[PDB]
Amino acid sequence: GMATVRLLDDAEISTLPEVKAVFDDIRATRGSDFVNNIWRGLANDPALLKRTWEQVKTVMVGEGALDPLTREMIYLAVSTANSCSYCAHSHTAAARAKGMTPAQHAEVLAIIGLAAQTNALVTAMQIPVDEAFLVD
Amino acid sequence: GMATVRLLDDAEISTLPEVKAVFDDIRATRGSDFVNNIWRGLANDPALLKRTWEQVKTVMVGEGALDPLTREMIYLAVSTANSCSYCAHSHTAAARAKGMTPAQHAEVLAIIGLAAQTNALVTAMQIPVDEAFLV
Amino acid sequence: GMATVRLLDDAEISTLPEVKAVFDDIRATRGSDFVNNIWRGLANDPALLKRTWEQVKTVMVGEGALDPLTREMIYLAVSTANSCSYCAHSHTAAARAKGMTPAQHAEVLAIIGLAAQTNALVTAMQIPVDEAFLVD
Amino acid sequence: GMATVRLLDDAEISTLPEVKAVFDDIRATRGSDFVNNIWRGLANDPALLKRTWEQVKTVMVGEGALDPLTREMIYLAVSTANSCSYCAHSHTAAARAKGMTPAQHAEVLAIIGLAAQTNALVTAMQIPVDEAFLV
Amino acid sequence: GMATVRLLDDAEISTLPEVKAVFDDIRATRGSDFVNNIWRGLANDPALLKRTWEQVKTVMVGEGALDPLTREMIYLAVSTANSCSYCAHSHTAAARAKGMTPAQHAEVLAIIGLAAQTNALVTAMQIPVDEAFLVD
Amino acid sequence: GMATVRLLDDAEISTLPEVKAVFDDIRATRGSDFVNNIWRGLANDPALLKRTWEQVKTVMVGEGALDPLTREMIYLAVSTANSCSYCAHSHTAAARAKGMTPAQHAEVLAIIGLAAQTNALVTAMQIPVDEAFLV
Ligand code: NA
Ligand code: NA
Ligand code: NA
């Protein structure tokens, strides 16, 4: 296929208790029977699959200091700066599912573009850290 | 110096009308006298200085989609993923000044670490885009 | 095509002695008549093609401090961190050809994910280098 | 300070039972008293500290696919390609402590430089994936 | 489609004065009726579209310290180092349109490869900045 | 030290015939006695030192497609986008020594910032490649 690993289908996963447990938890957690490809590739290693899902579930689900949409927008900006194409798609879809409006999307993009610009400029100028930033 | 350009000080900026216009605008906009070093470096090219500041005002300052703190936390996240040291400092400072609490900072860091990991894993596996995402 | 440069075929390469010399050496070295696309794009500039191949041959082939499989796993991790999609494919194939097991692959992935995480966290925290790391 | 978070010292960690549990576990695991600064930064968020340490133990410590040194050299390579200065230092130190010799270090650097170059060249040419790799 | 945003067509754009103004300026500036996809995705947010185009027009068009071809080659090298696949294509096409020869292209590639190599080596070695570089 | 390898000084290089050959060649090539620290780090692996220098001479030095300054400015741009601090310094210095003026430096920075922004925006939107670019 196009991944460097096999993408496991539901039929195979039902024969793999460790993997089925994780996939059913994803579905129960997300409120949808759709589980996206990232998980189907991680499924080749049950231990990694569970470590990754447990993190995602802890960080991105439940009460916390930031609302779920805000968390997805941060995830989307990070995915972009890391130039992960799949991640740009999945987290844009997830942001939309968590209520991201066109207006909000446009602003997220604007920030990602501006930040990339100023980051590059700072790096080219080798701006030293202001001493005011270093006070305890 | 330590930068690859000179960092213009206030004394020099006094006699540079196009540049003082921006520094005045920055100070008038942030309510403070302190202008950080990025701007002092950009000041070598008054046009680029103006363009950069205009973008920052439009995107970052005022009524808009997202609150100022949310914008700043997205800005911090980008700065980290792009590996810019100065920028991590500057935008951690900005987010705090815009009211980022310890609790919020901890969750931003957790999201940044987690996204770094999944991004890396997806890239290694070369996961193709779900047809669902394309409809 | 899809590359920003032409991909040279065997028929054309046989008319180009400088390029044919390199391609035949790749085949002799690798023990296979298959030469992958990277080389076919580099072939547009014979000098660059030979500089690149000579490096690859020196670093990745022959006795050295690390075994060939270990070298490919490092190459694969680097390719990933540099987000080169083609390189993720080619070096996963090369790692497999050099004996990488499913278990080993899963561990390489695990390290790449964990390292990306801790690298990001360190960068966000701007952790200063421990003085113990700086002793001569 | 120089970090964007405080680096908890042993005195503070003494009275932080969830955090001392991890520092004790780290020390008990590495056989040494020295815990590097990354952990002291992570200690501000005891949960993230625990999660990060659990991953490191599972992936990096003990019987597994690859020897500990090989794991460390892959970790070093990633850290370099991601451009993390602290991490280059920390994992060069770890690899040496796990027995990386001058000769091995030189070859890792050579591979890292070479991969950087070919990755860059492939990206510029936008080489499509061979159909062979997809069967 | 394949973008995470809609790509606006000419028919729709003619109903959107703000967006049509920008697109016609691109065409007038570039001397061609072809406007590439980046602009059609930015078109979902007129304000961002105009901010981006105004920058591009100011920096990349008109008299300045560097000739237009040189500007495109720098843009292409940056795009590559940022691993933006679309940008590698568009700026290679733009460089060619501004007169880039095969010989020049090969040299740009050579520099991009070499720089990526030395940058990686310096980073792995953590080479400290020579004091000679720090004199005012 | 501050580097993860030792930086060989001229005294050590005196008695290292393969390495002095390169340092002599570098100095003979640049017309100057000053050899920057990158080479002193590479000198730990004489073979890698030689390979790296051979590439630099072939690509960067002499008659070729592009003038030496243009090559250096492309090299600077790459170094910035790859986020290498030392390299930003070294290649800003090289470009100046090869005649980069304030005006040229300002435009390089402007291009680097602009490309960073559009690259980021294209990646976020996942713009597909125009069929025009593929004919
Ligand atoms: Na002054
Ligand atoms: Na204390
Ligand atoms: Na000495």
CATH of the domain at F19: 1.20.1290.10
Q: Please choose, from the candidates C72, F25, E119, the residue with its C-alpha nearest in 3D space to the C-alpha of residue D116.
A: E119
In degrees, to the nearest 5, what angle opens at C-alpha A83 toward C-alphas F109 and C101?
Answer: 135
Q: Which of C107, C109, C112, C119 to mutate to test the interface with A (most CBs of A within 10 A)?
A: C109
Say which amino acid occupies D129.
V
d(CA F66, CA F49) in angstroms, rounded, equals 25
Range of C37's domain? 1-136
Burial (CB count within 10 angstroms: exposed 0-12, middle 13-18, buried 19+), residue A125: buried
Contacts of C45 in chain E (CB under 8 A): 102, 106, 109-110
CB spacing of B106 vs D82 below 8 angstroms: no
CB B78 within 8 A of CB A113: no
Q: For residue F33, what are the contacts with CB-CB under 8 A and spacing of at least 6?
A: F27
Q: Is B95:A54 a contact under the CB 8 Å cutoff?
A: no
- The answer to whether the CB of E78 falls within 8 A of the CB of A123 is no
**Which residues of B are less than 8 Å from F106 in CB distance?**
44-45, 48
Residue C52 sits at the chain E interface (C-beta within 8 Å): yes
CA distance E128 to chain A (A): 14
Cα(E105)–Cα(C6) distance, rounded to whole angstroms? 12
Chains in touch with A (3+ beta-carbon pairs under 8 Å) read B, C, D, E, F
Instruction: Say what the resolution is, in angstroms.
Output: 2.0
Written as one string, the DSSP assignment of chain E is --SSS----HHHHTT-HHHHHHHHHHHHHHTSS---HHHHHHTTSHHHHHHHHHHHHHHHSSS-SS-HHHHHHHHHHHHHHTT-HHHHHHHHHHHHHTT--HHHHHHHHHHHHHHHHHHHHHHHHTPPPPGGGG--
- Judge residue A68's burial from the number of C-beta atoms within 10 Å of its C-beta, 0-12 exposed, 13-18 middle, 19 or more buried: middle
Contact status, residue A87 vs residue A109, Cβ threshold 8 Å? no
Q: Closest-lying ligand to the alpha carbon of B13?
A: 1
CA distance F113 to F119: 10
Number of CB atoms found within 10 A of residue E9's CB: 10
Q: What's the angle, vertex CA A66, arms to CA A65 and CA A70, rounded to 5?
A: 170
Residue B19 burial (CB count, 10 A): 22
Cα gap F132→F135, rounded to integer Å: 6
H or E element in which residue A133 lies: none
> Nearest-CA neighbor of C95 among C65, C63, C60?
C60
Sequence-distant (≥ 6) Cβ neighbours of residue F132 within 8 angstroms: E34, E36, E93
Residue A26 backbone zone (phi > 0: left; psi -120 to 50: alpha; other: beta): alpha
Within 10 angstroms of residue F35's Cβ, the number of other Cβ atoms is 18
D77 touches D46 (CB < 8 A): no
Three-state DSSP class for A100?
A: coil
DSSP code per residue over B20-83: HHHHHHHHHHHTSS---HHHHHHTTSHHHHHHHHHHHHHHHSSSSSS-HHHHHHHHHHHHHHTT
Structure token digits, residue E86: 């679309």
Using an 8 Å Cβ cutoff, are F133 and E98 in contact? no
Alpha carbon F47 to its chain's center: 19
Which residues numbered 83-112 in C keep a CB inside 8 Å of some CB on A? 83, 85, 88-89, 92-93, 102, 105-106, 109-110
**Torsion angle defined by CA atoms of residues A20, A26, A29 and A34, in that order, rounded to the nearest 10 degrees:** -110
Tell me how far the alpha carbon of residue D13 lies from the centroid of ligand 2, in angstroms.
8
Give the separation between CA B21 and CA B25, rounded to whole angstroms.
6
Cβ-based contacts of B109 with chain D (< 8 Å): 45, 48
To 5 degrees, how large is the angle CA A35–CA A40–CA A41? 145
Residue type, B97: A
Residue E110 Cα, gap to closest chain C Cα (Å): 7
Across the interface, whether the CB atoms of E127 and F86 are under 8 A apart is answered: yes
SS (H, E, C) chain D: CCCCCCCCCHHHHHCCHHHHHHHHHHHHHHCCCCCCHHHHHHCCCHHHHHHHHHHHHHHHCCCCCCCHHHHHHHHHHHHHHCCCHHHHHHHHHHHHHCCCCHHHHHHHHHHHHHHHHHHHHHHHHCCCCCHHHHC
C79's CB contacts (< 8 A; 6+ apart) are C87, C88, C91, D115, D119
Q: E66-94 in b/e burial notation, b at 16+ Cβ within 10 A?
A: bebbbbbbbbbbbbbbbbbbbbbbbbbbb
Cα B8 to ligand 1 centre (Å)? 7
Number of C-beta neighbours around residue A124 at 10 A = 27
Q: Which stretches within chain A are classed as H helix?
A: 10-13, 17-30, 37-42, 46-60, 68-81, 85-97, 102-125
Select from F80, F108, F124 the Cβ nearest to the Cβ of A80.
F124
Tell me the nearest-neighbour CA distance from F124 into chain A, angstroms: 5
Chain B residues in contact with F113 (beta carbon < 8 A): 48, 52
Q: What span, in angstroms and rounded, lies between the C-alpha atoms of F49 and D106? A: 11
Cα Rg of chain D (Å, integer): 19
Look at residues C48, F99, F61, A81 and name the one whose alpha carbon lies nearest to residue E112.
C48
- From the list F79, A122, B22, F9, the residue with the least C-alpha distance to E130 is F9
Task: Compare all CA atoms of chain D with the CA of B94 and give the residue at the minimum distance.
Answer: D4
Distance of alpha carbon E118 from alpha carbon D113, whole angstroms: 7
How far is F66 from F70, CA to CA, in rounded Å? 6
Among D81, B79, C125, smallest CA distance to A123 is for B79
Rounded to the nearest 10 degrees, the angle between the axes of helix B102-125 and helix A46-60 is 150
Supply the angle between the helices C85-97 and B102-125 in degrees, to the nearest 10. 60
Distance CA F75, CA F59 (A): 11
Ligand 1: centre distance to CA D91 (Å): 43
CA neighbor of E120 nearest in space, from F41, A36, C3 = F41
Residue showing tokens 């815990």? D35
Query: What six digits make up the tokens of E61?
Result: 């068009």
Nearest CB partner across the interface for D84, out of C4, C5, C122 = C122
Q: Report d(CA F9, CA F19) in Å as an integer.
A: 11
Q: Please, which experimental method was used?
A: X-ray
User: Nearest residue on chain E to B132, judged by CA atoms?
Assistant: E1
Suggest the residue from E2, E4, E129 to mutate for an interface test with chain A (most A CBs closer than 10 A).
E4
Closest CA to B118 of A88, C59, A1: A88
Q: Which residue in D86, D107, D111 is closest to C122 by CB distance?
A: D86
Q: Find out whether A89 and B127 touch, Cβ atoms under 8 Å.
A: no
CB nearest A106 (choices: E44, E83, E84): E44
User: A134 and D2: CB-CB below 8 Å?
Assistant: yes
Asked whether the beta carbons of residue F118 and residue A121 sit closer than 8 angstroms, the reply is no
CA dist., res. E50 & res. E47, Å (int): 5
Report the chain D residue with the minimal C-alpha distance to residue A51: D55
Whole-angstrom distance between the N-terminal and C-terminal Cα of chain C? 53
Alpha carbons D49 and D18: distance in angstroms, whole number: 10
Q: What is the DSSP string of F24-36?
A: HHHHHHHTSS---
Nearest chain F residue to A115 by CA: give it.
Answer: F117
Q: Compute, in angstroms, the gap from residue A34 CA to the centroid of ligand 2.
A: 49
Other chains touching B, judged by 3 or more CB pairs under 8 Å: A, C, D, E, F
The length of chain C is 136
- DSSP-derived letter for residue C45 is S
Residue of F121, F122, F125, F127 best to disrupt the A interface, most CBs of A under 10 A = F121
- B27 contacts chain C (CB < 8 A): no
Upper half-sphere CA count for residue F113 (Cβ side, 13 Å): 27
3-state secondary structure of C3: coil
Total number of domains in chain C: 1
Six-digit token pair at F95?
């470009």
For residues B94 and A115, is the Cβ–Cβ distance under 8 A? Answer: no
